Design a binder for these strands. Structure first.
Ligand code: MN
Ligand code: MN
Ligand code: ZN
Ligand code: ZN
Ligand code: ZN
Ligand code: ZN
Lengths: 543, 545
RNA sequence: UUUUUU
RNA sequence: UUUUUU
């Protein structure tokens, strides 16, 4: 009896670079193709994309692609991925496809078979797969969950989601809980669900509540208002455009990425500015209380607009006492220091600084425990793969499932590369495939690996000494320093002596070029450690 | 034109760390504390930060003595560095504070430091102009004091670092001296200096007695071994754990050099009293799992502390397993979030039960939240106010809190390190600045690593490096060495050579000084690699040759 | 919101 | 919990 294989290639045991492979027989369907953002220890790199060794091996079996939404951790890896694979059908909702199309054009990727769907549509992949799209609210529009119908039964994938009763834009957007409930009645064999906020009790706040909170705050602001949020948070931004209009403020969209997303959102009907956007020059004609800037830089990026404002380097705008700055965002793990740096600079300028939790001006795009419980109760799945989370999230999602009236028969904590076997009464990890990370640094893809990073870490912590050692005319050593210590004549003289004394034992004996280096390298390491207590990288050199 | 008190913060203002405050009246100085600070992520490779003491060196003959409020590292960690460069003067503090400093000075070989023990209520004199009176304030370490500094212009009340804990839980009757603080308000407080750490937190910081109750409830329910980490200096927390362990039939192992160190100091000064002797890891191995509790270093995610080694499977004598419970009785300090998260995920992957806030209320801050800060402001009714021990966000929010109360201070200032704050019966202003700032410690080096050195470290960390050396003879050729730049690639290597070489050759073809030529080849390669890779590696060009 | 140091 | 891009 053939089984379905669920093979996560990214997005399990991490938050980022989501990509999930489904295989039945010799047919494959792939879902998403995200990037991930670098951690602190991954110094100097720009982004991370998934290893696609498995898809390369089985590329002839790929029948199609599903794209759940246009967040970068779901579509950011596609330029890299699609370039190495056959041009298969790629299905997605309008805003998702618009963002992908633009991204593919930057990379000069030609003839990608993008195919528009909408909620309720059924899409056939080969003989064995049918996928049905349904609406789930999230922090970007045109976000979908799906039901993948297979020979062994149905998989429901929630997508990334929250259950927001009212996103505030008046477009009637709501999660299709009716469809999800019916799926539970029809029978869900496997649930795949968003674990991001599985450790958070209660219910994620509604965007309509955040908008009310923002209007109340902004209504009370005496002068200019500056607000930062994710450029892709179309609902948040639309609601701000409407409250601004009601509060007699004109809006400036500041930052390249803000203008970019505003363009795609408008083109696909999700953004409708009640009054036209103005430039900073144009709003300069207005009184302070008539002005609102919606700005990039919610995560503390120094070169984003908020960053330049906070550091006094913005070319056309200068913050001053009386200004209000609203951070309509929470720092993502790893960005705490950067955001804090901007916050303290803002206090020092003397602006009024508004942020959570002091002011309730942000709602997560992801379901908290009550919402995750709702989906588990409605679907009543036989089997469960908590997804889109680090192990702590997945495991807490699993624990939450056990608190409910009808828990799954079995729950697994998948890792990237796991082959998860699915059948009517089968649910197990049956093996593994090649999975992992590929680093992008500038233009280069995979030229930087973990070995290289290790080097960057050593340089950063201990600094560098370059030593040119010459036996001719008489043995002597010369020194260039980087990040080791400030200039010290005393110290500098002593290190040459150590290296030159070491060539002496080498020089008096017959010494090969190679043999000498290690000996004096040992001399300096022994010495420099003695003198400074530090272990700087040294690169020996002979002319 | 009347003589004024100068309050000159040299550290601890506009930051959390390296606290040190100078009081000057005429030709007399009293100094308070000598802390270190911990490096930020951009300060790569360095171990700790100590204050610039240029001011104290200039005026060393005027220094009458020192007040040490408590033994936390951000109040005493700089003293070895500071005391070594100054005259021996009287140094006052409570017993645990002095025990910790004494040991610190011993490690450094510093001799003949004049440590003088005080206790709550003691009044000590510094020269003609200063009298300091110590009083108890609860905090996350024992023997923590605030003080009233009585000067010719009036009284300064300094809260020290504090919370208002009604019961730290150790059965020793320890409580903040709010009676004394209220009396100070009636006598008249000219200037209040208060701890702003938690000024953005509404309500009241939880009590250690509640945390102890919560820990006992959790531990009573643990089926197997329990490992717990907290700050090694959280003597109240640890003592309460010792006592609940006894009630719950578990023996205790203190693990990690630092745990043993603070336990030694706490026991020697009577703050820690284990109801049963500590055991070693070998000794508890004789016991059933549910009889065992490990109190471990590593609460901030340090990979080489005990919890770190347990989490990574590298502990030489102990191995975690499914069924173990690990409790993080702490919250990550800003900047340590990633390190703690790393350990938490490894613990989950091992399969231990992992217990931490906010899911479980197993930690209480050592510092006052807004209700407690308001209580102090209301009791002292100060004329002038210096919010302290906080970054500007904390200080400014403390100032705003003061404005909401029934009797706000006449004036509140947000001081910066190096500020000269002038204080008189009706004067409160910043009148100038003095040299202030950071000195980095890296290994044995003090001040040999500076910001210029760090900037180089950043650039190296990000872009890696390319050292290009041009050799003129016999025929000019270029040599390339890369570290942390990219994995080996011969094609690119040879391309970099030619771009450099053309500049060398073209530069020789039209005459230029060797210094001019290196610049030309640095420029060409920077232009080439940026086009080729999109990166700007650190470039070290050499023409000698 | 203070260290940690097989 | 997703980018920013004087
Ligand atoms: Mn880079
Ligand atoms: Mn170091
Ligand atoms: Zn998303
Ligand atoms: Zn996502
Ligand atoms: Zn303290
Ligand atoms: Zn402190």
């Amino acid at each position: 009896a053939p089984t379905l294989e669920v093979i996560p290639l990214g997005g399990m045991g991490e938050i980022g670079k989501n990509i999930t492979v489904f295989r039945y027989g010799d047919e494959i369907v792939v879902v998403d193709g995200g990037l991930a953002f670098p951690k602190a220890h991954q110094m100097g790199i720009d982004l991370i994309v998934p290893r696609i060794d498995y898809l390369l091996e089985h590329q002839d079996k790929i029948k199609g692609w599903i794209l759940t939404h246009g967040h970068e951790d779901h579509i950011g890896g596609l330029p890299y991925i699609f370039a190495r694979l056959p041009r298969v059908p790629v299905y997605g909702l309008p805003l998702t496809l618009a963002l992908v199309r633009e991204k593919l054009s930057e990379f000069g990727l030609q003839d990608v078979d993008l195919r528009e769907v909408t909620y309720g549509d059924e899409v056939r992949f080969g003989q064995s797969f049918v996928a049905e799209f349904f609406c789930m609210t999230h922090s970007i529009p045109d976000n979908a969950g799906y039901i993948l119908k297979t020979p062994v039964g149905d998989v429901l994938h929630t997508g990334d989601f929250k259950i927001d009763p009212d996103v505030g834009t008046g477009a009637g957007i709501v999660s299709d809980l009716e469809r999800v409930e019916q799926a539970g009645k029809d029978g869900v064999l496997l649930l795949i669900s968003d674990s991001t906020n599985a450790e958070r009790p209660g219910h994620t706040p509604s965007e309509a509540e955040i908008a009310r909170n923002l209007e109340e705050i902004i209504k009370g602001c005496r002068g200019r208002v500056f607000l930062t949020t994710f450029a892709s948070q179309v609902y948040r931004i639309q609601n701000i455009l409407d409250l601004a209009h009601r509060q007699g403020r004109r809006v400036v969209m500041e930052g390249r990425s803000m203008i970019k997303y505003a363009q795609a959102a408008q083109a696909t009907g999700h953004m409708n500015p009640p009054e036209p956007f103005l430039t900073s020059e144009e709003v300069g004609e207005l009184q302070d209380q008539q002005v609102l800037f919606v700005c990039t830089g919610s995560q503390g990026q120094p070169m984003a607009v908020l960053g330049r404002l906070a550091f006094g380097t913005h070319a056309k705008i200068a913050l001053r006492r009386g200004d209000t700055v609203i951070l309509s965002s929470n720092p993502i793990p790893g960005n705490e220091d950067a955001v804090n740096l901007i916050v303290n600079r803002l206090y020092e300028i003397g602006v009024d600084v508004v942020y959570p939790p002091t002011y309730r001006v942000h709602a997560s795009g992801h379901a908290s425990q009550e919402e995750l419980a709702t989906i588990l109760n409605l679907t009543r799945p036989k089997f469960f793969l908590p997804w889109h989370g680090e192990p702590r999230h997945q495991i807490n999602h699993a624990k939450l499932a056990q608190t409910l009236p009808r828990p799954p028969k079995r729950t697994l904590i998948a890792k990237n590369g796991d082959i998860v076997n699915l059948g009517p009464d089968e649910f197990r990890v049956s093996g593994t495939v090649a999975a992992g990370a590929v680093y992008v640094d500038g233009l280069g893809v995979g030229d930087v690996n973990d070995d290289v990073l290790l080097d960057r870490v050593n340089l950063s912590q201990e600094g560098l000494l370059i030593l040119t050692a010459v036996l001719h005319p008489t043995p002597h050593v010369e020194v260039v320093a980087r990040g080791f210590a400030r200039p010290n004549r005393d110290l500098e003289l002593q290190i040459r002596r150590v290296a030159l004394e070491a060539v002496e034992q080498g020089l008096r004996e017959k010494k090969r070029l190679e043999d000498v280096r290690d000996d004096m390298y040992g001399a300096v390491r022994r010495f420099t450690r003695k003198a400074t207590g530090r272990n700087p990288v040294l690169i020996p050199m002979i002319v």
